[PDB]
């Protein structure tokens, strides 16, 4: 709890879509190396020997994303062989957990400058490609009462009373704010276009966005998780625990749920002495981090206790925060979080979220962190709180202050 940790850079690739995506031909390793080369372009005199670790989140570390992809990035990009490289997986919050771990490594004093972030090419390494015990082991699956995140989202809307039009209203809101952010040039500095080995353009925008979304178009969509809940029996499993709920209202579709996309993100975190030695300008400061959890069957109510803990840990209240950024895994998760803490709507996901732009699991936490660093600077605001819901019923939250 000594050395303060500062964010010096925070960049990300555009998010390419799952079906006929522009990034499907791009190896996940190349997405990370492309962001490393951009950091060199922005700081051509940075002594990379002072970088002591590269921490990358990745939820499916198999195949193209296996074998410690962080270390592969260090060696492939020609970084100093002393720069480390470690992969971690805390499900959806892996990207923010990497940043938090980097910030904690700096605060302990035993690390000076750390690259943190995540990568996930869901079109090449689909979700669940890594297996696991909670799903593919009957004795464990039976006792833990495994239920997919989608059923838990529908269950949240059922308990809280969020109708189909309620969640679709948030989906339209996210598509509008994302389009307004791209049109206003908000993302011109932090979204780094992906190029090939000859410098040719591959993707320069978040191609999952549908800016022309309307309320009528969303109403026509079918519940995307009705055949999975019925054929899998996961509805019955969830209601055995939530026995006072008679029926689950399946309100979530492919229009009000986060998109499956490819992408990567990178954040440069260091101490004050590390930034002054390398001639870096601090953009924000990591004020506090926190990790909590909630029921694993409903799964997606984790961000509420994690936000309260990071607020009490930093000695702050809801009123002291200017911007709230919560990953848009499902619309009901954001509406539940907004209802629990009475978040002013004008402060919540003000540049849009994963419903419009996509949720590249391992990288999403670092992406929305860099989004808030840019938006605090653009608005000349002071504080932002970032949080994500996590599979298994976990939650991670982080508070940053503009510097």
């Amino acid at each position: 709890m000594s050395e303060e940790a500062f964010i010096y850079e925070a960049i990300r690739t555009p998010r390419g879509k799952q079906k006929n995506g522009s990034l499907h031909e791009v190896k996940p390793l190349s997405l990370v190396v492309g962001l490393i080369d951009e950091l060199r372009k922005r700081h051509p005199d940075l002594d990379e020997n002072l970088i002591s670790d590269v921490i990358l989140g990745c939820v499916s570390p198999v195949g193209d994303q296996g074998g410690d992809i962080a270390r592969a990035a260090v060696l492939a990009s020609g970084m100093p062989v002393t720069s480390g490289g470690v992969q971690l997986n805390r499900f959806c919050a892996s990207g923010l957990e990497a940043v938090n771990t980097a910030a904690q490594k700096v605060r302990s004093g035993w690390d000076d400058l750390v690259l943190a972030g995540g990568v996930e090419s869901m079109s090449r390494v689909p979700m669940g490609s890594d297996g696991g015990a909670m799903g593919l082991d009957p004795a464990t699956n039976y006792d833990v009462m495994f239920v997919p995140q989608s059923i838990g989202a529908d269950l949240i809307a059922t308990i809280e009373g969020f109708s189909r039009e309620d969640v679709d209203a948030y989906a339209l809101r996210s598509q509008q704010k994302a389009a307004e952010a791209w049109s206003g040039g908000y993302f011109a500095k932090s979204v780094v276009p992906v190029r090939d080995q000859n410098g040719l353009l591959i993707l320069d925008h978040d191609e999952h966005m549908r800016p022309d979304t309307t309320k009528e178009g969303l109403a026509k969509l079918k519940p995307a998780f009705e055949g999975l809940a019925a054929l899998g029996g996961f509805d019955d499993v969830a209601l055995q625990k939530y026995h006072w709920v008679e029926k689950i209202n399946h309100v979530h579709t492919g229009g009000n749920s986060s998109g499956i996309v490819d992408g990567a993100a990178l954040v440069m975190i260091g101490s004050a002495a590390a930034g002054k030695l390398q001639g870096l300008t601090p953009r924000a400061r990591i004020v506090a981090t926190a990790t909590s959890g909630a029921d694993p069957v409903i799964m997606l109510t984790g961000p509420t206790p994690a936000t309260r803990k990071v607020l009490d840990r930093a000695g702050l209240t809801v009123d002291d925060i200017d911007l709230f950024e919560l990953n848009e895994a499902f619309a009901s998760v954001v509406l539940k979080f907004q209802k629990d803490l009475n978040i002013p709507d004008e402060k919540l996901n003000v540049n849009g979220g994963a419903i419009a732009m996509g949720h590249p699991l391992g990288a999403t936490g670092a992406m929305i962190l860099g989004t808030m660093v840019d938006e605090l600077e653009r608005r000349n605001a002071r504080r932002a709180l970032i949080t994500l819901c996590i599979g298994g019923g976990m939650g991670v939250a982080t508070i940053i202050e503009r510097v």
Binding site: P138, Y142, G232, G233, F234, L239, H243, W244
Partner: protein, 729 residues
């Protein structure tokens, strides 16, 4: 390491050895201490000696044939020993099944073909012996069954049944088709699904066909002789292993679907089977087999297996052997049956009577009513021809035995009467009055009555000796229990005739002494009354239905109350109140009675009137009535789910104890099988009487733990949960 159970240290031999001039060894199983072959200590030692001899003489042995000299092939494990296994015996149980499978594994890998000559029933360990062979031939004889019914007794196929069937058919097919339900197959079905390879007409052709197959196998396929498919280098498990992307995509849905099917009931055998199947498919055969042994020992030393072995083996065997049948009564064949009433009960009684091959006269007040009663059998035969379980010429003769009529003269020649009219004493007196002189002189006069005592109904007829209670259960075509009630003037001669008739239609009988409510109706009443009391106390109706399903009941209690009709329940509460107030006493109304009268006042008396605790549209059940939560202030009381579950189970367990004390029931076997098969008491308990001696919760196990939990329930919910003195010390 050894084919024997002990490395140190007198059992009778059960296997006969015979090596012919060709080098073919025939192992004929013939246990001299019983009528059937069973995996007892005698078999284990005998098979260990045989397998040792097969190895020592391997240079002069070309093939092996496993056969039996009993009526059946092999019956399976020794239930009398397995039911006594304690948690401290887990090591001995584990060592026993490992030794059994070591013998079968050596037999399986001799390098020469082994053929199972299945002459009769091969069940459980019996089929497991046959699965260790490389070829199975079954005689297509009557009464022959093949399967792994261990899950029916709270166990799993621990002699390699899980491991080998998963190797044969893959995880999904083996679990669904064979393991999870313990299905018993006839030899023709066994060959169809793949448990058997070839069929013969008689038992005399088995060994010759087995030796002929060995001779052909040694010439046609000399490299693969005696090598199971999973012992070849290029083995591929059907449906894939858990590490293949195809199966890995649907594998997480197997435990959830299983949990959906069991509705959350505490029955550990199916989950243990699924775990053993999947875990075994991840490793080599021998490692898979050892994992199977560990899950087997976990079930055998547990309490549920003891409950289900007690009910579905010992209690069922004591009943099927005339345990409640009168002594020394001769059989009296039945010529023609007369069913009074064409309602769902009477129509169901006519179907199961005609399906058993009897002539049935179905009488009602009008010919239009008796015809739609026969249409109940016609709708069942149509669904039987679509699925393909019967032929047209056989379904024609079934419906032809049902003669719908509206005239009492058509009961001429009827020597067996089954009345199923409305619950009313003088109505049954009038209905029997029109018919007691038209039927045969020695005709049985049976009454399908829910609560009205049989002694009172017998006064409405002349010959009270042939009047008896024959209680069926809806739907009659699927419910397997017949509750036989003996009135005061009912003779033992009529007891045996109804007992035989119950067995003739393929149902299980219990004998009950006359009393208002008998056993099934009285006990099931405490079940639905306990749930309605929870609704009145303010418990969410969704939680009440969840507590019933997770307790193990086939239907949740509010749904069942709608089928039972609340006006019948109010009528029963009036008859109970009248008997107390006519004896000068003060009636203590069950708290459910206020809920029953409230729903009747609101015009929601059940499914017959299209409105109950559920809404009904187009005959189908829609969902819980939205006005229910406002009527009873649902949500104001939120007790723990296990309290709701125990309140239902204990209410029935306690009422079963009273029925035993009052002499209503004569044996705990009738109590257990009657509660399971009659009113749907959860089978994992082994019955509402076994639930007392086998209760297991966070507060221990046994009768003492049952009384402690009952006292805990009585302190929080009412004195009705106080244990009677017959359970105390």
């Amino acid at each position: 390491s050894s084919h024997h159970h002990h490395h140190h240290s007198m059992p009778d031999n059960t296997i006969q050895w015979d090596k012919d001039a060709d080098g073919i060894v025939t192992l004929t199983m013939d246990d001299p201490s019983g009528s059937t072959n069973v995996m007892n200590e005698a078999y284990i030692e005998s098979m260990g000696k045989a397998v040792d001899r097969l190895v020592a003489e391997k240079d002069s042995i070309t093939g092996v044939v496993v056969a039996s000299a009993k009526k059946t092939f092999f019956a399976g494990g020794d239930v009398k020993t397995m039911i006594q296994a304690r948690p401290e015996d887990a090591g001995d149980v584990f060592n026993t099944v490992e030794t059994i499978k070591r013998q079968l594994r050596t037999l399986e890998t001799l390098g020469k073909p082994v053929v199972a000559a299945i002459n009769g029933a091969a069940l459980g360990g019996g089929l497991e012996i046959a699965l260790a062979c490389h070829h199975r031939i079954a005689a297509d004889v009557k009464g022959s069954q093949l399967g792994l019914p261990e899950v029916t007794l709270g166990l799993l196929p621990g002699g390699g049944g899980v491991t080998r069937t998963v190797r044969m058919f893959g995880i999904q097919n083996a679990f669904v088709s064979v393991l999870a339900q313990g299905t018993r197959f006839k030899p023709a079905k066994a060959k169809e699904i793949g448990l058997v390879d070839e069929l013969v007409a008689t038992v005399e052709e088995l060994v010759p066909a087995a030796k002929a197959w060995i001779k052909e196998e040694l010439k046609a396929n000399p490299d693969g002789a005696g090598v199971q498919p999973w012992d070849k280098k290029g083995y591929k498990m059907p449906g894939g292993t858990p590490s293949s992307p195809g199966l890995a995509a649907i594998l997480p849905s197997f435990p959830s679907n299983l949990r959906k099917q069991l509705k959350g009931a505490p029955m550990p055998a199916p989950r243990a089977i699924l775990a053993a199947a999947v875990e075994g498919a991840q490793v080599d055969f021998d490692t898979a087999s050892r994992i199977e042994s560990r899950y087997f020992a976990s079930l055998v030393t547990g309490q549920v297996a003891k409950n289900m072995m007690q009910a579905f083996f010992f209690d069922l065997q004591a009943i099927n052997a005339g345990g409640s049948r009168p002594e020394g009564i001769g059989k009296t064949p039945i010529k023609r049956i007369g069913v009074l009433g064409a309602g769902m009960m009477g129509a169901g009684i006519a179907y199961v009577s005609a399906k058993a091959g009897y002539e049935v006269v179905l009488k009602d007040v009008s010919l239009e009513a008796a015809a739609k009663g026969k249409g109940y059998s016609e709708k069942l035969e149509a669904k039987a021809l679509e699925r393909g379980r019967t032929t047209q010429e056989r379904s024609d003769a079934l419906l032809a035995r049902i003669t719908p009529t509206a005239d009492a003269a058509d009961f001429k020649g009827v020597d067996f009467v089954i009345e199923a009219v409305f619950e009313n004493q003088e109505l049954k007196h009038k209905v029997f009055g029109e018919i007691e002189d038209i039927v045969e002189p020695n005709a049985i006069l049976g009454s399908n009555t829910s609560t009205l005592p049989i002694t009172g109904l017998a006064t409405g007829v002349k010959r009270q000796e042939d009047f008896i209670g024959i209680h069926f259960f809806s739907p009659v075509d699927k419910m397997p229990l017949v509750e036989i009630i003996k009135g005061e003037k009912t003779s033992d001669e009529a007891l045996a005739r109804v007992f035989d008739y119950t067995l003739a239609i393929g149902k299980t009988p219990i004998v009950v002494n006359d009393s208002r409510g008998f056993f099934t109706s009285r006990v099931i009443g405490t079940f639905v009354n306990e749930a309605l009391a929870m609704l009145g106390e303010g418990v969410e109706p969704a939680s009440i239905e969840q507590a019933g399903s997770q307790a193990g009941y086939p239907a949740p209690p509010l749904q069942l109350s709608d089928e039972l009709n609340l006006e019948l329940m109010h009528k029963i509460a009036v008859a109970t109140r009248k008997g107390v107030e006519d004896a000068g006493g003060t009636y203590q109304p069950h708290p459910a009675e206020a809920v029953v009268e409230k729903m009747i006042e609101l015009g929601r008396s059940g499914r017959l009137k299209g409105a109950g605790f559920y809404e009904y549209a187009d005959g189908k059940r829609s969902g819980l009535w939205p006005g229910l939560r406002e009527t009873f202030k649902s949500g104001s009381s939120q007790p723990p789910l296990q309290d709701m579950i125990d309140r239902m189970l204990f209410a029935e367990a306690l009422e079963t104890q009273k029925c035993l004390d009052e002499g209503v029931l004569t044996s705990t076997a009738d109590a257990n099988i009657g509660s399971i098969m009659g009113i749907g008491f959860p089978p994992w308990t082994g019955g509402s009487a076994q639930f007392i001696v086998g209760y297991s919760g966070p507060a221990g196990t046994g009768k003492a733990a049952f009384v402690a939990r009952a006292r805990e329930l009585a302190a929080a919910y009412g004195d009705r949960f106080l244990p009677p003195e017959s359970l105390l010390s």
